Amino acid sequence: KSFVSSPIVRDSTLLVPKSLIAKPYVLPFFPLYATFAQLYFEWTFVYLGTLVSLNILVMLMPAWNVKIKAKFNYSTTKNVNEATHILIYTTPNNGSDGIVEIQRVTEAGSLQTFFQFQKKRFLWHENEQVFSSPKFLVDESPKIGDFQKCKGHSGDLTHLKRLYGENSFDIPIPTFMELFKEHAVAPLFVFQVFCVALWLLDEFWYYSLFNLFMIISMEAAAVFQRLTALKEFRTMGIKPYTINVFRNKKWVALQTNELLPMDLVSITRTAEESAIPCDLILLDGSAIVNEAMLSGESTPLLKESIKLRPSEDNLQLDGVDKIAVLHGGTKALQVTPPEHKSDIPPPPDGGALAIVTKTGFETSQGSLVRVMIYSAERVSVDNKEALMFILFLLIFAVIASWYVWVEGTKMGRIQSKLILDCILIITSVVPPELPMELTMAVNSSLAALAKFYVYCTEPFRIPFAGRIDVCCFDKTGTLTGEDLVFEGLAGISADSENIRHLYSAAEAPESTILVIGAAHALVKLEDGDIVGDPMEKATLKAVGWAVERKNSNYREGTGKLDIIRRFQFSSALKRSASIASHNDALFAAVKGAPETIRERLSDIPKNYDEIYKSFTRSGSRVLALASKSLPKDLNRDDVESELTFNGFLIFHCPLKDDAIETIKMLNESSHRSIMITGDNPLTAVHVAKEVGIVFGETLILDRAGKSDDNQLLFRDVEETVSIPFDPSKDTFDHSKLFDRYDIAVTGYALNALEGHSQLRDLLRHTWVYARVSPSQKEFLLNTLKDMGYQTLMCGDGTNDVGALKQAHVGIALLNGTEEGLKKLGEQRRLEASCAAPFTSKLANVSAVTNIIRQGRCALVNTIQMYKILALNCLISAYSLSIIYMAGVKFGDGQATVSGLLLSVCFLSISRGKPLEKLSKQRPQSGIFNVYIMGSILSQFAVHIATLVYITTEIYKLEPREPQVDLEKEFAPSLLNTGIFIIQLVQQVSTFAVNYQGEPFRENIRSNKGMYYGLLGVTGLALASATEFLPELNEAMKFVPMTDDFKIKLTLTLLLDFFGSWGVEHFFKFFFMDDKPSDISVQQVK
């Protein structure tokens, strides 16, 4: 049981094919044909018809559902040598079931049973008798001695080639013919071609031909779209380029394809439009990688070797040992050759050494591409509401067809020809485009978005963006510009007679001007450039340093300084340290957040507590600087053991000019917006108040005293009010605290309140969170999802990738310039993050408003299309019923003209423009709600009332009498004319009545296309009805009408339109928008 062993599969059964005689249709259907031929040797024709229909349907049934295919064609067996096909039952969240072939190849005297499912290999291990995916050494149990031990592959590596495969993406794009063949067997297209075959049987020639051409066109267009999408995915593949590889104890040139795990390679500067081959791990040398893809930020990291680490005891952790790993798909700006000699010869090229770990689809970028392409979830996969809706429509059609049959039998008509009319009605009621509705809307919305440089990776998240309950933001990098102006240094003097004193430049002693030079991460590249964080470059320029090609940055007019070794910065550790050396001696510099640096240095200044609070109150951003003298490879807790103060850094943060308006629009558009930052709560509260998240006074939570006693104290921003709280005993007083202040919560108080009962009551009212570590952001977003509110997070950098992934819809704002993109587009004419579900290249923050508007428009357009299709189908069915009751029937030209005059409106209707300003009314999801059913049923009631009235009128003018053996021949008659024109006018009126309202997208008068189409079609229908022009009526074979009849015919249609408009307007006014949540209410203080 459960032969295949992998987290993808759930259960499997082996299969073996069967011959044609064993097939479930060919052999059992012979006796039926035999008895049919015996009985034959009129009414007997329908028997052969239904038998051929059942046969041709059974022949196609297997391709629809794979379980049916396995049950029909294949027989289950337990012999693993006999089996030639295997079925795979997938787990709930991974793809869908399928049938895959089992292949056999003999190598080294041993046969190997292997197949490939979802581009993830398998193999047959004899001792365990199970199918198991290949697993790499890094994942299971790394031994840091083995990595340094490895010396490269040698000998015949054929088994490895079989087990791990070629190291490249394998995405085949099929030909147009194969894809159209795959589409042809779909149930919907088969249903449509059967419907057209009926009309061909009913002697409708031109109508059927036009319908068939339209069907073919639609299918071809869909196939072109899908092929374009598959072609677009392939761009993530990288063209193989040559690197050197250590095989057979010497260096040989190989391509990127021939790479396997644990195989030595030498990487150089990444060529243009290329990246690192696969997931490496450094063994010697250095590099400067740019995690632009995975992380989403351009700041370059620094990677070092693994050689210095102890080999025996340590285990490769991928935690503190992350500086070695080099992910696949990130450009490496520079590499430095190995310093010292080792047993293995130097690389012929200047690159540093590396060891391979994973290849192909199992790397990070590769696994993400696989999940994006194959295991993605389609929009509305369940598709239950549409089936219930279609069952509703079929019930109505059966109600009509029963009366059709009764009247047809009563009027003497032959049943052999009446059953075809009944089937025509029943198959005519059904709208085919209904299940494939929302997909086209989402694709149109994506195409509209991509014009604003907002690229989408996973499309099925768009309907979530329509109705978002709460949306959260990051502070620096998202709401605040990237350029940072330097104000000055403060608090460096010890006397501190003035709290707000600034030493601009060259007024501080040598200590601090050396400190800022030592504690930096900038580096000058080979060709000559400077790459680093903008804040750091700004401060280093303003102070007056200059960085050279080597590590030594000098020529500041004060000496020559060089950096020996540096420690990496982290989010969880708010501190960065570097060790430097001067012409005289050696020291150590540290630079980090003030609250944490206060707990490290030895001499606590007298005004240290007060200066940074007094400066943080108004906008500024502050960092601390401390240095310690150190006499001549060591740990980390020794350099940051105890330090000495040197001064503060005070930066100013300029708001993005776009940030002010979007937040106001979101506050007025029935959304609640909160902030999640990293800085101390003073700057957070200040920016939140300047943008418009919090209006009045705000309260802050934090530790009460220096002792870690876990007691939280509500304290005002200006220290005027102090209110104590305890996590064990006291509980929040709603009226005293939450109504008056709208408190802001620090990360520490969130850590202490873990497990509390009123935690979820607290997380309702707070709008601002400060000093949170990346794990706490994930916790916050998961809790907000848990309460039932859908979320949106717009994040700047790698600080919050975990939070971005958890949100229902996430955006990553990559920094960019409009002029740079224009120049790049011009260069491309003259001649890709994958970090979050969505990506935006422009630095502006309007992308949130843009994507919300587009999602809302997609939803509301889906609703409109549902209603319009349903009503048109019902009207057509009942009109055909009323005609087919008697003997009369349409002509070919009349039906074809109706088809064209409706397709003209179909073409124009989809074109529309969204309103710029968002509206409070949020559209509800789901087919079944009071609005849709009420509107549809009432409009249909008015339509059938008018139709019954005019039918009674026409029967009263001319009476019909039962003639034996009626035959539905076309001839001009009052009934034909009246019903044809009423059908046309009402099918046109449904569009004009149910076009989507103003508050969401636009009015009807704004767009000229649909307006001119509707006015022209109504003018044509009227001029046909009011006999204004004789050539039109005489040329289309309409009977001349009585002067008394035309007045009633026109007035009933006019009143019908007005009644439909009135009812639809009432229902829209009353039951359209669902109520906003409780969290998003703009309560006053």
Ligand SMILES: Nc1ncnc2c1ncn2[C@@H]1O[C@H](COP(=O)(O)OP(=O)(O)CP(=O)(O)O)[C@@H](O)[C@H]1O
């Ligand atoms: N290279 C660096 N060196 C020293 N201190 C740094 C630093 N980078 C950040 N800090 C300090 O650590 C604190 C927390 O860092 P963190 O990255 O979590 O927040 P942040 O403001 O830098 C990004 P965001 O605003 O998106 O949350 C920062 O406020 C800053 O005081």
